[PDB]
Amino acid sequence: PYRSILDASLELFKFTIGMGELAFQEQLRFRGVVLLLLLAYVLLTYVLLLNMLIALMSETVNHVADNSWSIWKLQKAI
Amino acid sequence: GKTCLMKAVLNLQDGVNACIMPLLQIDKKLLVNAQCTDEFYQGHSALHIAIEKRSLQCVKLLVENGADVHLRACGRTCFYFGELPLSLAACTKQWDVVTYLLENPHQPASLEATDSLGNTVLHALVMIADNSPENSALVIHMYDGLLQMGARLCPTVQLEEISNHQGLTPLKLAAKEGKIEIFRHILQREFSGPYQPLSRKFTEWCYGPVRVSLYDLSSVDSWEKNSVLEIIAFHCKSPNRHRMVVLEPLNKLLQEKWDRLVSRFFFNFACYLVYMFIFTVVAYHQPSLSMLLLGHILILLGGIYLLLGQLWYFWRRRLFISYFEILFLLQALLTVLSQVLRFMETEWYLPLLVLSLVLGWLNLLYYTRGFQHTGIYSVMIQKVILRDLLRFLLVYLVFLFGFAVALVSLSREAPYRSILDASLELFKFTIGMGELAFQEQLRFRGVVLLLLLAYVLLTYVLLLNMLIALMSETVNHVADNSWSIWKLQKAISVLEMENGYWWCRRKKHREGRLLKVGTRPDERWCFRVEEVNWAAWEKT
Amino acid sequence: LEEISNHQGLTPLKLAAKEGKIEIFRHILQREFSGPYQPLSRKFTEWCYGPVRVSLYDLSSVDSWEKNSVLEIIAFHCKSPNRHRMVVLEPLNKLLQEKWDRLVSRFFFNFACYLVYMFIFTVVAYHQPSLSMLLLGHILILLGGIYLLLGQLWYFWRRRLFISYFEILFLLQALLTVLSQVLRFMETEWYLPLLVLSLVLGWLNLLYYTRGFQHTGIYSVMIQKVILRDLLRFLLVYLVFLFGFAVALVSLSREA
Amino acid sequence: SVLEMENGYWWCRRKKHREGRLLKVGTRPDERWCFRVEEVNWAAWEKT
Ligand SMILES: CCCCCCCCCC(=O)OC[C@H](COP(=O)([O-])OCCN)OC(=O)CCCCCCCCC
Ligand SMILES: CCCCCCCCCC(=O)OC[C@H](COP(=O)([O-])OCCN)OC(=O)CCCCCCCCC
């Protein structure tokens, strides 16, 4: 568990597809600090996802349906 | 505490009363100087009472009676206008009182007189202003009239360059109060007639659609010890900070500062990213039990330098007490604490080193405001997301501890062995990992399942509420606001670094070039904006 | 003529509020006359000094001191959706601000004395034996439950025509706490589940006081108004799907 | 919230207090209770 950069990176990325475990595993020393860091990582990943969603919504609000049809006509011209 | 003079100065037919003159004649202490002494209003006399009534005849009679216009009121919701009778004309949009109060018979009542609160007539006209368009127009017209009249009374005195008790000129006071309506008029003020020396904006030569626009940078170029830019960045407190920055020539001056200070901003970014990378490398190869020693001494020097680089910031800017400005101090402090704890109680040093590394990797996001294609992106994280997620998380923790204690109390008969385990299991239903089981090893499995179902429903309710709040904020949001606040952030960045690093104390350089118009010499610093405007040209 | 009640006992000023007819109500409340009809006016100006305007208002049958007034009718007896719109209009907004700035000293006391009860309930539940100070908690939670039970029955004894989301939960939680502390003497097997079900309802009812803070009032609205109005409809359809698919799966999975 | 608590707690039955102050205008005496709002309005004043 977390033997190298690759394993830890994979475990942290696992909290995107909603699969990673958030455990107070005590086989590894400083379990409290590990749990706190994982909690902070989860919070920051949710912050980033919320920021991406808000950016997409801001783009959608300023968007217009006729613009999509116009750019599709441009693509057909190309 | 009202005297017979106040009763005479009271309202009467046609806004005048012959008893006011008869009372003064019958007196021959002056009855005109009599004023109330109550805590609600002390010093309010007939001189201001008649002026507030907009009675030109009564004011003229009182002046002829020997009333001293230089007398100032005091005392306590009320009118925040100045105590000077000359500033009392702000209660009249037609300047009827001021028309006589300037060059009156045997009572000059000069505008240069300072009020009891310090602010002059021009400063009072900006303090008593409002953001409403009607109030804005009323303030602008009165300010223009007062400035024009100033050229015919004590013309050698610069009425717009006198500071109050706080040390701020009306130009600085308008920025501090965040009163953008009057501030825009003051900053871009121009006159075509004899008031040309009083103007700030000038046009040099219009060639086709190209317009050269000069501006006056007096007390605005940030070279002086106290200017508009420094007040807006740090001393101001109004939400309108992000709106004043857009207005020219502040935008152009900030652009010129940025295009000359990127050469140091990117150097700072590189020399901080190198420190972060070295910190990461040292942490990764940290022993569990020569080059590594070099890293530790470097991270000690690197931490100390950054610690001083932020204490110097908090030693300054005392009234400014900025989100990232505390984290850099905190990360440097924790790094120094860790490198000190390496000599005593070494068991805790590595956790502190990791907690410093994570804060460094998060503080690296500060420099994202320096790139044009990431400035807008860097705004929404700080402004709204961190303002709503904290409120969401507090409610979530309130739910979490309560449900954890409930589960621990319920599961006490024939997993969830303590508060910590139950809290972790309940929090697990956020990353979509926790199990929702009818586990029968623990007694009351039905009630446990019902409570877990209720917890899941309430967590979804809280998440939906957070999403709806974010959507409500997004709908009311505007794309130009993000760019404006990013420009404000760039202004904050440049004004800090223009003062120079703490160790070097880089000397300041005066912006613009010396230009003179008319004659007071009138030599002054100016900054040359060139703009193309077909619509404005079409009015010729 | 404006102070005569109908068969229902309501004056036209009160009737306009009850019907939620904000258009006429705003005119009636802020009515003013400059001529001989000055005594008929309600709004007055005393002295205008520069931009500062002093505006007097008539609080006859509006100050909530009388046995039946505009405020009480709007809060409880009214049924129109326009209740949230009449409150903004002055001087009702100013009167409510003055009442709030004088009753926060009791609202926060109530919040503290309910949070203490909730904390004691939590502590007693956590250390509850599976088989002196603990006995003190049980008698306190019994007295605390009874007091809150009476504090809500007194509400439902009143406000008969008003039959409020939180007002039923506080009664329900107190009733369940009392029921649990009674069942501790007979059929004790079920007492702990009821104690936990009361604790969770207490921790949810704690959210009622969030309306007392200016920086949480807006936040506390959207939960009650819309989310609980739509999630119930979503969950009913979800359960309809759930039971059907569950029966289908059980019927289908009957062979190796 | 305020109208419920102004009636007082069930056990104590707190006495009510009349809001505002007594003011009289014109003559019917016309003594009545009034509440004094102070507001600043430049736009309304500009109509004078
Ligand atoms: C030259 C070799 C330097 C080796 C690394 C030394 C430690 C650097 C630590 C570090 O991150 O400093 C950042 C800082 C600039 O960013 P900032 O202060 O704006 O970032 C924080 C803003 N809130 O850095 C500076 O201001 C100094 C940059 C180096 C110039 C030489 C300094 C000599 C001192 C006597
Ligand atoms: C003084 C020590 C009291 C020890 C705790 C007693 C049990 C308190 C239970 C409790 O939560 O009561 C809340 C209530 C106030 O909130 P509310 O009724 O508005 O909350 C519900 C709103 N829907 O409380 C009150 O109204 C009373 C507060 C205490 C004052 C003394 C009372 C004496 C009675 C004879």
Swiss-Prot record, chain C:
Residues 176-189 are extracellular. N-glycosylated. It is found in: Cell membrane; Cytoplasm; Melanosome. The chain crosses the membrane at residues 107-127, 134-154, 161-175, 190-210, 232-252. Residues 155-160, 211-231 are cytoplasmic. Homotetramer. Interacts with a cAMP-dependent protein kinase type II regulatory subunit (PRKAR2A or PRKAR2B) and ACBD3. Interacts with SLC50A1; the interaction probably occurs intracellularly and depends on TRPV2 N-glycosylation. Ubiquitously expressed. Expressed in dorsal root ganglia, trigeminal ganglia, spinal cord (Lissauer's tract, dorsal horn and dorsal columns) (at protein level). ANK repeats lie at residues 8-34. This is Transient receptor potential cation channel subfamily V member 2. Belongs to the transient receptor (TC 1.A.4) family. TrpV subfamily. TRPV2 sub-subfamily. The gene is Trpv2. Calcium-permeable, non-selective cation channel with an outward rectification. Seems to be regulated, at least in part, by growth factors, like IGF1, PDGF and morphogenetic neuropeptide/head activator. May transduce physical stimuli in mast cells. Activated by temperatures higher than 52 degrees Celsius; is not activated by vanilloids and acidic pH. It comes from the Eukaryota. The chain holds residues 287 to 562 of 761 of the full protein.
